């Protein structure tokens, strides 16, 4: 998990989803790209 003020799609397979009031990037392709705004 990357925990960052700036979260963003890093590849074509990255997806923005809001869960429990937190912006998150999930990615099917790459575990490194999983992000949490914080």
Partner RNA sequence: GUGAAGAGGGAAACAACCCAGACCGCCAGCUAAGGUCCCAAAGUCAUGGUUAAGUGGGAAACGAUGUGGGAAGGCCCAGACAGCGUCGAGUCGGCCUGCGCGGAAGAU
Partner RNA sequence: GAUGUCGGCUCAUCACAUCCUGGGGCUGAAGUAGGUCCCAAGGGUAUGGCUGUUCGCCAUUUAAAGUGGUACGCGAGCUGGGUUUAGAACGUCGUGAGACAGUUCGGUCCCUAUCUGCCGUGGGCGCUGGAGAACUGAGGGGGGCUGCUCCUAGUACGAGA
Partner RNA sequence: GCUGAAAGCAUCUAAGCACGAAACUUGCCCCGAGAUGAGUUCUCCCUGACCCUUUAAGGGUCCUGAAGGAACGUUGAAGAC
> In the complex, which residues of this chain contact RNA (CB under 7 A)?
1-3, 5-9, 15-23, 26, 28, 31-32, 34, 37-38
CB of 9 to RNA, least distance (A): 7
Yes or no: say if 9 and 25 are a contact pair by the CB < 8 Å rule: yes
Nearer to RNA, 11 or 16 (CB): 16
DSSP at 5 = S
The least distance separating Mg ion from the CB of residue 31, rounded to whole angstroms, comes to 19
* Residue 5 to residue 3: CA distance in whole angstroms: 7
Assess contact for 8 and 23: CB atoms under 8 A. Answer: no
Which residues sit at the interface with Zn ion, rule CB under 5 A?
10-11, 13-14, 27, 30, 33
């Amino acid at each position: 998990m990357k925990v960052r003020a700036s979260v963003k799609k890093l590849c074509r397979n990255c997806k923005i989803v809001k869960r429990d009031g937190v912006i998150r990037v999930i990615c099917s392709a790459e575990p490194k790209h999983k992000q949490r705004q914080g």
